[PDB]
């Protein structure tokens, strides 16, 4: 029983996820998605300077 | 019999836990867990000021 407890602890250190870290990464990538979407939508409007010159 | 009683007293002073102290430590760490959880959840929302500037 002792050894089972210690070995399950050891395995958990390797296999399981950390919620405190992974939620932070998720929120960071959410914000980056919104920023990149805005920036790409603004980037697709660059060829319209030619209509002004034309 | 006398010596057994006195030596068991001596060992108890070293090995056994104090409930009055240990319950207090437990309650303190409970409250700190709830506070730290709230503070981390509030901390993961900081990159959203950029969306306002954007």
Automatic annotation (TrEMBL), chains A, B:
It is found in: Secreted; Bacterial flagellum. Coiled coil: none annotated. It comes from the Bacteria. Residues 1-54 form the Flagellin C-terminal domain. Belongs to the bacterial flagellin family. Flagellin is the subunit protein which polymerizes to form the filaments of bacterial flagella. FlaB is not essential for flagellar synthesis and motility. This is Flagellin. The chain holds residues 219 to 272 of 272 of the full protein.
